[PDB]
Nucleic acid binder design. Structure first.
Ligand SMILES: Nc1ncnc2c1ncn2[C@@H]1O[C@H](COS(=O)(=O)NC(=O)[C@@H](N)CO)[C@@H](O)[C@H]1O
Ligand SMILES: Nc1ncnc2c1ncn2[C@@H]1O[C@H](COS(=O)(=O)NC(=O)[C@@H](N)CO)[C@@H](O)[C@H]1O
Lengths: 319, 442
RNA sequence: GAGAAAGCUCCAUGUCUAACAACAUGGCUUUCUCACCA
C-alpha cells in the first residue's frame, strides 16, 4: 500500500464539511428520495448542474485522450458469458456483479459490468499488425454493477448500480517492458487529468486482484466524506485476457503471439462528482466550478435552481 | 399466470390507484367503440360492454360500502347500538372480499384500453400515413452507392463480422471515425438543446415493471420485446426501452410548480430492445440516443404547441446535419396504446434504397400522467394532471447509416458535414492508417 | 448484495372489538449484523 505520489493541498474550510448528498439535494442537482419502486434501490438521478458536470467531465477527458492519439471506440452493451469468463469475471457464482438476463427469454446474455469486457470482446480471436502496436482506444459507456454495498453509506451516491465510466484499453508488444511502460504512460495521463481538475489526490500501489499482474489505485480526498475514496483503478495484465480469449498479435516475422493488455479508467462520474462538489463547497452551499470545466458548464458559480423542487404527493406520507 | 403490476402496486399501497378514463367516454358508447376499433388495440369494441358492466357493478358496490361505513361511523360516534354495530361489521367484512375481486377484474381489463385518438390522425397502415413535408433532395451519384455496412467494414469503422460468440446476433461495434462521429452527434445535439434551454437529465437504465406499464409498454408478454433480468438474481427489474421511460419514472408520484411548467429535459442513455434486417445497423439490440421529454401545462393547446416545438427542433437538427429527411404523420393503427399524436421522421438512405424511420414524437397527454399520477399543482393549490410529450432528437445507428451512405464517394472516402467538421477535425475521412484485424479463429 | 431487528424519520391489507388501540402480513424510514469492490 505504498504511496507513490501525493498532489495538491487539502482545502481549509471554516465551517464543517457538508455531505455530497445534502449539498446536491439542497441545490436539487441529484434526487434520491422514494426512488425504490421507480428505479430500484440505490439508483440516482442527476439534473441541472449535475448532468452538465457529467457530460462535461466525460467530454473533457475524451478530448484530452483523443489529442494524445487514442482511437475512440464503442462496445456492445450486452455480452456473452464466455467473454466475461475471459475477462476474469465469473457469473456462475450466486453473488455476482454481472446482471443476468432471464434464461428462458434469452440465452447467455449478460449486461456489461465494465467497458473493458466489451473492448476485450472486440479483440477476441483476432491478429493485430506488428506496426499498429501499441494501440490505445478509449470507450465511454454506462456500466452496471449488480451489487452495491448497503452496510456502509447506503444512502449515498458513492456506490451505485449504474455509473458512467470512461475506459482506456491498450494492446502492447510482446515485451513485458512495453506493457509496463504503457501502463506507466496511462498513469501519468490520468494524473495529469486529475491535476487539471484540481482535486487533491494520492496514488498508491495495490499489493499483488488475481487477474492483474500489477495495479495502481488513485484515491481522491473528499471534504464531505472526510476520508479518502478510491476513484480510479489501473491494473496491468500479462498474457491473460488474450491467453484466455485466444487473442494473438502477428509480429513482423509472422509468428503468432499473445499480446499484453493494459486497462485504465479515465474517469467515473459519481466519485468525481462527489470530490468536485465537496472540494468547492461554500458557506451558502454554492459550489465553485474549476476554470478548466468553466467552458463546458458555462457558469462560473452554481446557484440555487430557479425551478421549485418537486414535492411528494405519494401515499406513504404522514397526514 | 398473468397479472398487472399497477393493480398490484395499488393493492399493496405503493402508489395511488390510477384514475381511469372509462367514465370519460361512458357517455357515448358508439364514439368509444369507433375510436377503439380505429386504433385496433389489443382490446376490441366487442369486449367493451363487459368492462363497462363490471365497472357499473363496482360503482354500485362502492356506493353501498360507503353508506354502510357512514352508518357505522355515526353509530360509533353516538355510542362513544352494539348489536347493530356487530351486524354492520359482519356485513361489511362479508362484502369486502367480493368488492375487491370485482375491482381487480375490472381494472385488469380496463388497463388494456388505449388513449384517445386525435381527429387529425389518418386511419390506415404505415403506408397510409400522410407525409407532412420533405427537406432536401437525394444527392446525385455517378455510381451506385454501396451499403453502409460494407463501407463501414471497408473503412473498419463498423465491425459486424463474426460477432455471434461475443455479442450475439445483431451486435455492432464502432471504431475510429465512426466512434468520433457518434460522439460528435450526441454532443452536437446536446449542445443545441442546452442552448435552447433544455435542462439536462440522466435516467437509470434499469427500471421496475410498474413504470413500464405506466409508460404503456408491455413489460411481460410472450412476444414481449423488453429485456427482463433473471428473477432469482433480481426481481421486477427491466431494461429501459427508451430514456423517456426513465424520465417518466423520475417524475412518478411528484408535483411540479406551475411557474416551472413547461419543463423540458434532455437525457442521453443506452436503450436495449429485444427486436424479436439480417445484416446492417438498421436493427440493433442496443443503441445510444439523445431523448428530449417534456411535461407541459394542463391545456391541450399547450401540449400540442410543445410537440410542435419538438418537431421543429428535430427538423432543425437534421437540416443542420444536411441529411435528406421527410416528416410523415403516423397512422391511427400504429399510434399505439400510450400515444395520442405521433410524428415519424424518415431519413433517405441511398444504400438501403428506402426511407428509414429515425425520430418518433408522442403526445402522452392523458395516459402516462394518469398511470403514474404525475400531476402539477396550481397556485391556488389544486392538482391538475399534466400532459407529457416525449420525442427522440437522434439515434446513432440510423443517423450513422444515413450520413455515411449520403456522403460516400467512389474512392471510398466519406465526406463529413460542416457541423460535425469541428468535432471531427477532418473535413473528410480516408482509409484507416491502422492495419485491420486478421481472423485467427479455427 | 444477503440476513435480522425496531417504529418512526410512519403508509397500506387483515384477525377480536360499538369503535380508538393492541397483535399479525407486507410497504417505507432508520438502526444492527455477515459479505464483494474485477
Ligand atoms: N458501485 C460503483 N458505483 C459507481 N462507480 C464505481 C463503482 N465501483 C467502481 N466504480 C468506478 O470504477 C472505478 C474502478 O473500480 S472497478 O469497477 O472495480 N475497476 C475497473 O473499472 C477497471 N477494471 C476498468 O474499468 C472506480 O474508481 C470508480 O470510478
Ligand atoms: N431495433 C432498433 N435498433 C436500433 N435503433 C432503433 C431500433 N428501433 C428504433 N430505433 C431508433 O430509435 C428510435 C426510437 O423511436 S421509438 O422507439 O419508436 N419512440 C420512442 O422511443 C419514444 N421514447 C420517443 O420519445 C427510432 O426512431 C430509430 O431511430
Amino acid at each position: 500500500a505504498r504511496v507513490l505520489h501525493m498532489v495538491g493541498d487539502k482545502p481549509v474550510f471554516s465551517f464543517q464539511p457538508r455531505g455530497h448528498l445534502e449539498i446536491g439535494e439542497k441545490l436539487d442537482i441529484i434526487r434520491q428520495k422514494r426512488l425504490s419502486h421507480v428505479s430500484g434501490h440505490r439508483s440516482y438521478y442527476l439534473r441541472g448542474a449535475g448532468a452538465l458536470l457529467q457530460h462535461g467531465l466525460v467530454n473533457f477527458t475524451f478530448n484530452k485522450l483523443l489529442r494524445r492519439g487514442f482511437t475512440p471506440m464503442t462496445v456492445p452493451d450486452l455480452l456473452r458469458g464466455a467473454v466475461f469468463e475471459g475477462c476474469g469475471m465469473t457469473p456462475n457464482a450466486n453473488p455476482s456483479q454481472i446482471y443476468n438476463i432471464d434464461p428462458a427469454r434469452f440465452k447467455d446474455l449478460n449486461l456489461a459490468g465494465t467497458a473493458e469486457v466489451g473492448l476485450a470482446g472486440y479483440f477476441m480471436d483476432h491478429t493485430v499488425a506488428f506496426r499498429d502496436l501499441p494501440v490505445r482506444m478509449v470507450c465511454s459507456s454506462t456500466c452496471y454493477r449488480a451489487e452495491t454495498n448497503t452496510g456502509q453509506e447506503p444512502r449515498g451516491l458513492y456506490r451505485v448500480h449504474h455509473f458512467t465510466k470512461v475506459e482506456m484499453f491498450g494492446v502492447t508488444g510482446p515485451g513485458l517492458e512495453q506493457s509496463s511502460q504503457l501502463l506507466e504512460e496511462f498513469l501519468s495521463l490520468q494524473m495529469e487529468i486529475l491535476t487539471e481538475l484540481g482535486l487533491h489526490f494520492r496514488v498508491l500501489d495495490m499489493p499483488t486482484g488475481l487477474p492483474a499482474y500489477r495495479k495502481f489505485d488513485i484515491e481522491a480526498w473528499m471534504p464531505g466524506r472526510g476520508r479518502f475514496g478510491e476513484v480510479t483503478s489501473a491494473s496491468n495484465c500479462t498474457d491473460f485476457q488474450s491467453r484466455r480469449l485466444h487473442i494473438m498479435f502477428q509480429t513482423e516475422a509472422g509468428e503468432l503471439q499473445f499480446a499484453h493488455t493494459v486497462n485504465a479508467t479515465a474517469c467515473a462520474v459519481p466519485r468525481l462528482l462527489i470530490a468536485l462538489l465537496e472540494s468547492n463547497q461554500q458557506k451558502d452551499g454554492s459550489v465553485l466550478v474549476p476554470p478548466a470545466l468553466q467552458s463546458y458548464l458555462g457558469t462560473d458559480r452554481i446557484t440555487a435552481p430557479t425551478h421549485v423542487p418537486l414535492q411528494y404527493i405519494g401515499p406513504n406520507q404522514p397526514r | 399466470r398473468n397479472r398487472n403490476l399497477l393493480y398490484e402496486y395499488a393493492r399493496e399501497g405503493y402508489s395511488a390507484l390510477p384514475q381511469l378514463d372509462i367514465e370519460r367516454f361512458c357517455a357515448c358508447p358508439e364514439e368509444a367503440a369507433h375510436a377503439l376499433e380505429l386504433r385496433k388495440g389489443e382490446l376490441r369494441s366487442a369486449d367493451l360492454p363487459a368492462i363497462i358492466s363490471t365497472w357499473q357493478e363496482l360503482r354500485q358496490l362502492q356506493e353501498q360500502i360507503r353508506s354502510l361505513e357512514e352508518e357505522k361511523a355515526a353509530v360509533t360516534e353516538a355510542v362513544r347500538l352494539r348489536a347493530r354495530g356487530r351486524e354492520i361489521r359482519k356485513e361489511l367484512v362479508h362484502l369486502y372480499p367480493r368488492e375487491a375481486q370485482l375491482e381487480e377484474q375490472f381494472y385488469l381489463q380496463a388497463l388494456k384500453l388505449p388513449n384517445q385518438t386525435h381527429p387529425d390522425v389518418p386511419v390506415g397502415d404505415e403506408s397510409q400515413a400522410r407525409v407532412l413535408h420533405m427537406v432536401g433532395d437525394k444527392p446525385v451519384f455517378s455510381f451506385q452507392p454501396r451499403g453502409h455496412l460494407e463501407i463501414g467494414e471497408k473503412l473498419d469503422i463498423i465491425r459486424q463480422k463474426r460477432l455471434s460468440h461475443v455479442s450475439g446476433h445483431r451486435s455492432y461495434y464502432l471504431r475510429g471515425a465512426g466512434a468520433l462521429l457518434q460522439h460528435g452527434l450526441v454532443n452536437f445535439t446536446f449542445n443545441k438543446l442546452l442552448r435552447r434551454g433544455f435542462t439536462p437529465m440522466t435516467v437509470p437504465d434499469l427500471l421496475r415493471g410498474a413504470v413500464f406499464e405506466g409508460c404503456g409498454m408491455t413489460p411481460n408478454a410472450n412476444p414481449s420485446q423488453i429485456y427482463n433480468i433473471d428473477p432469482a438474481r433480481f426481481k421486477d427489474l427491466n431494461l429501459a426501452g427508451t430514456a423517456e421511460v426513465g424520465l417518466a419514472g423520475y417524475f412518478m408520484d411528484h408535483t411540479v410548480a406551475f411557474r416551472d411548467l413547461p419543463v423540458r429535459m434532455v437525457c442521453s442513455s443506452t436503450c436495449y430492445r429485444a427486436e424479436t434486417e439480417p445484416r446492417g445497423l438498421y436493427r440493433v439490440h442496443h443503441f445510444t440516443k439523445v431523448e428530449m421529454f417534456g411535461v407541459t401545462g394542463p391545456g391541450l393547446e399547450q401540449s400540442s404547441q410543445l410537440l410542435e416545438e419538438f418537431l421543429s427542433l428535430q427538423m432543425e437538427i437534421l437540416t443542420e446535419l444536411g441529411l435528406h429527411f421527410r416528416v410523415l404523420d403516423m397512422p391511427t393503427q400504429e399510434l399505439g396504446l400510450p400515444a395520442y399524436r405521433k410524428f415519424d421522421i424518415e431519413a433517405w438512405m441511398p444504400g438501403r434504397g428506402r426511407f428509414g424511420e429515425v425520430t418518433s414524437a408522442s403526445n402522452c397527454t392523458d395516459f402516462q400522467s394518469r398511470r403514474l399520477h404525475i400531476m402539477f399543482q396550481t397556485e391556488a393549490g389544486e392538482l391538475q394532471f399534466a400532459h407529457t410529450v416525449n420525442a427522440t432528437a437522434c439515434a446513432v445507428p440510423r443517423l450513422l447509416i444515413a450520413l455515411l451512405e449520403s456522403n460516400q464517394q467512389k474512392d471510398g472516402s466519406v465526406l463529413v458535414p460542416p457541423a460535425l467538421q469541428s468535432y471531427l477535425g477532418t473535413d473528410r475521412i480516408t482509409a484507416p492508417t491502422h492495419v485491420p484485424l486478421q481472423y485467427i479463429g479455427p
